[PDB]
Design a protein around this nucleic acid. Structure first.
Lengths: 39, 230, 94, 63, 213, 103, 11, 63, 125
RNA sequence: AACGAGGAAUUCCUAGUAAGCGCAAGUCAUCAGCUUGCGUUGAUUACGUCCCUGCCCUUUGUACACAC
C-alpha cells in the first residue's frame, strides 16, 4: 500500500490580515464607547 | 487447464476506511489510551508519564496511568505489521475522554516519541492531518459509537488475560467467510479489563501468561496473517 | 324497502327496475319457460324465483350470485312468500 | 396488581400454601376475609389455565 | 346458467379516456400495473399490522395516521415505505419525488424478479423484522444488556427504517441510483440471502440477544 | 464485464456484472427462462447468471478448449445449451446435472 | 429495595 | 430454530419496570392454555400476537 | 329548464366549483379534458370517483369544474372532492335515492375524505 | 493558503408539528448585518411509564349512601 507523511508544527498578506482585524476590533470598540457616552 | 487473469501485474488493493462497509477486513482498536492536551504558561503539551509530574499531581491523576508510550509502540507495530503491507486492516483509537480517532492505513507514524506526541496534540486540536498529496485527509475523528463505525457483519472480542486461551489461528480460521473481525485491545498499563463489555460478545485469551499490549497485538496479528495466507 | 320492482317475463328472464325513476338496473337469466313468481325476502338479503320448468332459484341480492338451484318434480305455477318466518309455498302442477 | 402479575407456577405453590393454612386452621379463622379475597380473585383471573391443567392432586386439594 | 347483465348499453363518454383507465375501473390496481389480491402477508403476528387488504392507486392518500396510537398501523404499507424513503436531510418535503422514486423501483422489481412487486415488498418487510432485542441494564454501576421481546408494530417500523437506510447508504457513494439499489435491497431481502444491510443488522440484533439473554 | 439494462433508457445502468476479467465475446438472454442470462469470456468458461443474483456465477460451465466464442440454447429443452468453442468440437451441456463436462 | 407482588413471590 | 407464537392478553400495571419495556401476559397461540410472562419493548395493546424464541423461561422485574 | 346541480370542494386553501348538468357525457376540469390535469403522479387521484363508481353513471351527464387557490396537491384533492360530492348531489336531486345511498356507501367504504374535507383545527395541550 | 456535511459536551422537538422553498409588508416601543406576516411541499418515532432525574402532594374519609 502506498504511504505518506503528515503535517504539523506571505508576510504581506499576513500583516494585511492582522491589521484589518485590528481595525475591525477598534471600529467596534469606538462604536460601543461613543454609544455609551451618548446614552 | 485453467487460464490466468488477463493481467497479472502487481497492483495494490485500495486502502480500506470507514466508508467501505462490505469487504472482510481487520479492525484493531487501542482502547482507554492515556492521551490529552493541557496548557502551561504559554503553549499546549500532551501529557506523558515521565516528564510532567508537578502538574500531573496538580491535576490529581496517576503517573503510572498517564503514559502514551504504550500507544506509540502499539500503533507502530500494527501499522508496520505485514498485514497492512497486504492492506487489510485499519485502526481506531478510543480516547480516554471518549473521542474516536480513525487511523487510515496510509499514514507513516513518526517513530520518535516527541514527534509522535506533537502529532497527537495537533490532531487533538485540529481534528485532522493531510499528507504530502494533501488530497485525502489522513487521521480522521469520528463520533460514538464504534459499532456505528464498524463493518456490518463482524465479531466483538476483547483480549483479556482471565479469558481462556484459544489459538488465534484456530479461531480466525473457524470464523465465517464474510465475517470481519474487530478486536478491542486494552492499552491501559495495568488494571481491570471490564470496559468494552457492552460492545463485546466475548473475552478471549491467547496464553496462560500476562502480556504487554503491543506483544499481544503482534501475536493476534500474526495469527491473522497465518490464517489469511500472506 | 319500497324501491325495487321485479318483473318476471314469459321467457325465463327477470328484470329489476328501480321504481322512483322508471330506470332499469338489473337483469337475471336463469329460467327458460315463463317465470311463475318472484319474492324478495323481507331483509333485502335473498330473492327466490319460481319457474314453470319446475325450477326454483335462490339468489343473493345484496351480492349478485346464484346461491342455489332446486329442481322439483312438477311444473311450478304459484308461489307466496312469508317474511316474518322466511318461508314460502309453491302450488305445483301435480 | 400483585395477584395479577403472579405467574402460574407460583399460583400452584400458593394453592399448596393455602392447603397448609387450612391445616393450620386457627390462622384461617384469624384471617378469614383476606384469604377468601386472595383465593377467589386469583382463581377468577387465572381461571382458564388452572382448569386447563390436569392434576388429581390439584383436584383433591381444591376439594 | 346464471348470467347477470347490469350493463345494457356500451359505456362511451364523449371525453376521450385511456383504455387502460377503463381496465382499472374494472379492477383497481396499484399504479395500474399491479393488483392487490393473491397478496398475502405470509406471517402471522404481522397479518393485521401491515394493511394490505386495501387497494390504492397512488401511494399518496394523505390521511390522519398519527393521532391515536395505531392509526399508523392502519395506514397502508406502500405509503409507509414512501414516507420513510423521503425522510432524509435534503429530501424533507418532496413527496412527489419519493413517489416517483418508489414507482420506478417497483418497475425494476417487476422486470427483474418477475413475480410481483407488492408481494416481494411484503416478504422483505416480514423477513427483515427483528424478533428479539436487548436494552442496556440499569446496572447501578455494571453496564450490560438484557434480552427483551419486540412488538409487531415496532418490528414493522424497524424493518422499514433498516430497508430504506440501507438503500440510501448503498446508493450513497457510487454511480448507481437509489431506485436501483433499493430494488437490490428488496430483492435480496425477499431471498433472505444474508447479503443485504437489512438482514445483516437483523442477525446482529438477534445474535446479541441470543448471547446475553 | 456486462452491462444489463432496460431498452430505451441509456440513463439507467440497471446492473453491471463482473465476470472473469478476460474480455467477453458472447452474451445472450435465455429463450425459455427470462431471468437467466448467459455469457462467456476468453477464460473459455461460460457462465450462466441469474439476473436476480448479480454476484456469484449461478452456474459456471467448463469442458471447452480454446477461446469460446458462440453459444445458443435449445428451444424445446430449457436445460440444454450448446456452445461453439473456437477449436471446433461443438459441446452440448445439460444444466440440471453437475455440468462440469458437456453431455 | 423490592416491589410488591415480587415480595410475595420470593416469600 | 423452533419459533413460537404467543398472544398478548392483558398489559400489566403499576409494575416496577423500565421506561419503554413492559411486563405482559402471553398465551401460547397453538396451545391455548399455557401462559407465560414476557417483556415487550415496542408499543402494544391487548389481544395481539407476537413471536418468541425462548418458549420456556419466565420473566422477571428489571430493577 | 336544464337539470342542474352545483357543489364545492376545499383543501388547504383551494376552491373547486363543480357544475353538473344532464347532457352529452363528458368531464372537463376548467376548459381542458380531465385526462390532462398535469401532475401525472396524481391524475388517478383525480379519476378516483370515475373509476370507483364505473362510467355510465357519468355517461348520462356533463360535469364542468373550475379550480383555484392552493397549489398542486391541494388542487387535485379539491377536484376529487368536488367531483364526488357533485355526483352524489345530482343523483339525489334528479335520479333515484337508491343510487344516492349506495354511492354514498361506496365512497365511505373507500375513503371518507371524498365527502367531508377535514377542517384540521389546531389543538391545545 | 484553505477547506470533502463539521469532535467531546450541552441545548431544543410529538401533527399541518420537524425540515425544506419564494413572494410581501416595515405599523408611535424593537427591526435593516435585519424584523413580522402570508402562502405552497409535508414525514420519522412515543401518545407510554414513575425504574433513574428532579418537582409536587398528601400522609385524619367528614361527603350522606351502597360498597373497601
Amino acid at each position: 500500500i502506498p504511504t505518506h507523511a503528515p503535517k504539523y508544527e506571505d508576510r504581506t498578506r499576513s500583516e494585511i490580515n492582522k491589521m484589518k482585524a485590528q481595525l475591525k476590533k477598534e471600529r467596534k470598540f469606538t462604536m460601543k464607547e461613543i454609544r455609551k457616552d451618548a446614552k | 487447464q485453467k487460464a490466468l487473469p488477463a493481467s497479472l501485474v502487481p497492483q495494490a488493493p485500495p486502502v480500506l476506511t470507514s466508508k467501505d462497509k462490505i469487504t472482510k477486513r481487520m479492525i484493531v482498536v487501542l482502547a482507554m489510551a492515556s492521551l490529552e492536551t493541557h496548557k502551561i504558561s504559554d503553549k499546549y503539551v500532551l501529557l506523558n508519564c515521565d516528564d510532567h509530574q508537578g502538574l500531573l499531581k496538580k491535576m490529581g491523576r496517576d503517573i503510572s496511568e498517564a503514559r502514551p508510550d504504550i500507544t506509540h509502540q502499539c500503533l507502530l507495530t500494527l501499522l508496520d505489521s505485514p498485514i497492512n503491507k497486504a492492506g487489510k486492516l485499519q485502526v481506531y483509537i478510543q480516547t480516554s475522554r471518549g473521542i474516536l480517532i480513525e487511523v487510515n492505513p496510509t499514514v507513516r507514524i513518526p517513530r520518535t516519541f516527541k514527534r509522535f506526541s506533537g502529532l497527537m496534540v495537533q490532531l487533538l486540536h485540529k481534528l485532522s492531518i493531510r499528507s504530502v498529496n494533501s488530497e485525502e485527509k489522513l487521521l480522521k475523528v469520528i463520533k460514538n459509537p464504534i459499532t456505528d463505525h464498524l463493518p456490518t457483519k463482524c465479531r466483538k472480542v476483547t483480549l483479556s488475560f482471565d479469558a481462556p486461551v484459544i489459538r488465534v489461528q484456530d479461531y480466525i480460521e473457524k470464523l465465517d467467510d464474510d465475517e470481519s473481525i474487530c478486536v478491542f485491545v486494552g492499552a491501559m498499563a495495568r488494571g481491570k479489563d471490564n470496559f468494552a463489555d457492552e460492545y463485546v460478545d466475548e473475552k478471549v485469551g491467547l496464553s496462560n501468561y500476562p502480556l504487554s499490549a503491543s506483544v499481544a497485538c503482534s501475536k493476534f496479528c500474526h495469527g491473522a496473517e497465518d490464517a489469511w495466507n500472506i | 324497502c319500497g324501491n325495487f320492482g321485479f318483473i318476471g317475463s314469459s321467457n325465463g328472464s327477470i328484470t329489476i327496475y328501480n321504481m322512483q325513476s322508471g330506470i332499469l338496473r338489473k337483469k337475471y337469466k336463469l329460467h327458460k319457460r315463463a317465470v311463475t313468481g318472484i319474492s324478495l325476502d323481507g331483509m333485502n338479503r335473498k330473492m327466490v324465483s319460481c319457474g314453470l320448468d319446475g325450477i326454483v332459484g335462490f339468489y343473493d341480492f345484496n351480492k349478485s350470485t346464484l346461491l342455489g338451484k332446486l329442481k322439483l318434480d312438477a311444473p311450478i305455477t304459484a308461489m307466496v312468500y312469508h317474511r316474518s318466518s322466511d318461508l314460502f309455498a309453491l302450488a305445483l302442477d301435480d | 396488581d400483585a395477584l395479577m402479575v403472579m405467574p402460574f407456577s407460583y399460583v400452584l405453590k400458593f394453592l399448596k400454601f393455602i392447603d397448609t393454612v387450612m391445616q393450620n386452621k386457627t390462622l384461617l379463622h384469624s384471617h378469614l376475609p383476606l384469604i377468601c379475597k386472595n383465593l377467589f380473585f386469583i382463581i377468577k383471573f387465572n381461571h382458564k389455565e388452572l382448569v386447563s391443567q390436569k392434576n388429581e392432586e390439584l383436584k383433591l386439594q381444591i376439594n | 346458467d346464471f348470467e347477470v347483465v347490469e350493463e345494457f348499453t356500451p359505456v362511451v363518454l364523449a371525453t376521450p379516456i385511456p383504455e387502460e383507465v377503463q381496465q382499472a375501473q374494472t379492477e383497481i390496481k396499484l399504479f395500474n400495473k399491479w393488483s392487490f389480491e393473491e397478496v398475502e402477508v405470509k406471517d402471522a403476528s404481522l397479518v393485521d399490522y401491515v394493511q394490505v387488504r386495501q387497494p390504492i392507486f397512488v401511494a399518496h392518500t394523505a390521511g390522519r395516521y398519527a393521532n391515536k396510537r395505531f392509526r399508523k398501523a392502519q395506514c397502508p404499507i406502500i405509503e409507509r415505505l414512501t414516507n420513510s424513503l423521503m425522510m432524509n436531510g435534503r429530501n424533507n418535503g418532496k413527496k412527489l419525488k419519493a413517489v416517483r422514486i418508489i414507482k420506478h423501483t417497483l418497475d425494476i422489481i417487476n422486470v427483474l424478479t418477475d413475480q410481483n412487486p407488492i408481494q416481494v415488498v411484503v416478504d422483505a418487510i416480514t423477513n427483515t423484522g427483528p424478533r428479539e432485542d436487548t436494552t442496556r441494564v440499569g446496572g447501578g454501576g455494571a453496564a450490560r444488556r438484557q434480552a427483551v421481546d419486540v412488538s409487531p408494530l415496532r418490528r414493522v417500523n424497524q424493518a422499514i427504517a433498516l430497508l430504506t437506510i440501507g438503500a440510501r447508504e448503498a446508493a450513497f457513494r457510487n454511480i448507481k441510483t437509489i431506485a436501483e439499489t433499493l430494488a437490490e435491497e428488496l430483492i435480496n431481502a425477499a431471498k433472505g440471502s444474508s447479503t443485504s444491510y437489512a438482514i445483516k443488522k437483523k442477525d446482529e440484533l438477534e445474535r446479541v440477544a441470543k448471547s446475553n439473554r | 464485464l456486462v452491462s444489463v439494462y432496460d431498452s430505451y433508457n441509456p440513463r439507467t445502468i440497471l446492473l453491471s456484472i463482473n465476470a472473469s476479467t478476460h474480455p467477453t465475446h458472447v452474451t445472450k438472454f435465455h429463450t425459455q427462462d427470462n431471468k437467466i442470462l448467459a455469457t462467456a469470456s476468453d477464460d473459455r468458461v461460460t457462465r450462466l447468471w441469474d439476473i436476480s443474483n448479480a454476484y456469484e456465477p449461478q452456474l459456471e460451465l467448463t469442458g471447452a478448449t480454446d477461446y469460446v466464442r458462440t453459444l445458443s440454447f435449445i428451444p424445446a429443452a430449457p436445460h440444454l445449451v450448446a456452445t461453439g468453442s473456437y477449436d471446433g468440437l461443438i459441446r452440448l451441456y445439460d444444466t440440471r446435472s453437475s455440468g462440469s463436462t458437456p453431455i | 429495595s423490592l416491589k410488591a407482588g415480587e415480595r410475595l413471590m420470593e416469600a | 430454530t423452533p419459533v413460537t407464537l404467543a398472544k398478548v392478553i392483558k398489559v400489566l400495571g403499576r409494575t416496577g419496570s423500565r421506561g419503554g419495556v413492559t411486563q405482559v401476559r402471553v398465551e401460547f397461540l397453538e396451545d391455548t392454555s399455557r401462559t407465560i410472562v414476557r417483556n415487550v419493548k415496542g408499543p402494544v395493546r391487548e389481544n395481539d400476537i407476537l413471536v418468541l424464541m425462548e418458549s420456556e423461561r419466565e420473566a422477571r422485574r428489571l430493577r | 329548464a336544464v337539470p342542474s346541480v352545483q357543489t364545492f370542494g376545499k383543501k388547504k386553501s383551494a376552491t373547486a366549483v363543480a357544475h353538473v348538468k344532464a347532457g352529452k357525457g363528458l368531464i372537463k376540469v376548467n376548459g381542458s379534458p380531465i385526462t390532462l390535469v398535469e401532475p401525472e403522479i396524481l391524475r388517478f387521484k383525480v379519476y378516483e370517483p370515475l373509476l370507483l363508481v364505473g362510467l355510465d353513471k357519468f355517461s348520462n351527464i356533463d360535469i364542468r369544474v373550475r379550480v383555484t387557490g392552493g397549489g398542486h396537491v391541494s388542487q387535485v384533492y379539491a377536484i376529487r372532492q368536488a367531483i364526488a360530492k357533485g355526483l352524489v348531489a345530482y343523483h339525489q336531486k334528479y335520479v333515484d335515492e337508491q343510487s344516492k345511498n349506495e354511492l354514498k356507501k361506496a365512497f365511505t367504504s373507500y375513503d371518507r375524505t371524498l365527502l367531508i374535507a377535514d377542517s384540521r383545527r389546531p389543538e391545545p395541550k
